[PDB]
Symmetry: C5
Subunit: 68 residues, 5 copies
């Protein structure tokens, strides 16, 4: 499901090595570290991100994302 | 063969860790993770990318690409 | 705890392979090598980073950081 | 020897995992992993690269380059 | 000690996989591959770097550097 869509408001590198992004007022994390640099680039330029997951409630994990 | 040539319309990081880019209305994916940041930069800056593969039908895999 | 928040004043790659950043007049280092490229881009593009750690005194280690 | 000097006209990631760049009308490839992102950045920003090798004929391999 | 401080005049990827930079008219090389991309970004954007080592004569090796 399309959990959120918009610019990345902020991102955070976590001590457990996961990465968190806030999109549309909701926070999502991922343990896909390949995504770390891709997500940060998306944030600096303001690309529109679309967090895709099975659980869309804030604080959920995701491993699929589209960049527009 | 030269399957497609143009700007990257959108890119998508998949759950199986492959990366998908849409060029000239067709989608192609690759499992060469070195390409992810290169392909995103190309998308960001607006470079013309050329998807090279043996099978050119949308949904096909690729591991060779030219940046202009 | 939120140890420091502001722009990265300078960064330093150390001989032991840890990385140091100076934020808000205080220095912090980290041994997470994924953080190196992320911190440098944060520095080049002027992002506001938040150093998160248990010990906030200058010279302390950290492994969590927020990019705004 | 200084085989070629100028902007990277285009680059290409090959199926065998080597990388090709076209400088001054001639093509050169390399199998040095580390060079790939460095060459792409050089291409992105338009730096003047100098391909250095023993054989300077188009289609030759190289593992030394200067970024200007 | 602070061997040199200034912009990176040029950088060079060497055949033995070490990386050379020229700062303040002196050349320095490093075998830390993590530094390669960091040094090239510093060069690309004009940061002031500070080469830190025990031997500061041109042609010396270094593995510590500050970015401003």
């Amino acid at each position: 499901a399309d959990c959120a869509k918009g610019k990345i408001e902020f991102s955070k590198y976590n001590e457990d090595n996961t990465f968190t992004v806030k999109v549309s007022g909701r926070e999502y994390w991922t343990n896909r570290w390949n995504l770390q640099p891709l997500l940060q680039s998306a944030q600096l330029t303001g690309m529109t991100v679309t967090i895709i997951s099975n659980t869309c409630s804030s604080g959920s994990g995701f491993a699929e994302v589209q960049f527009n």
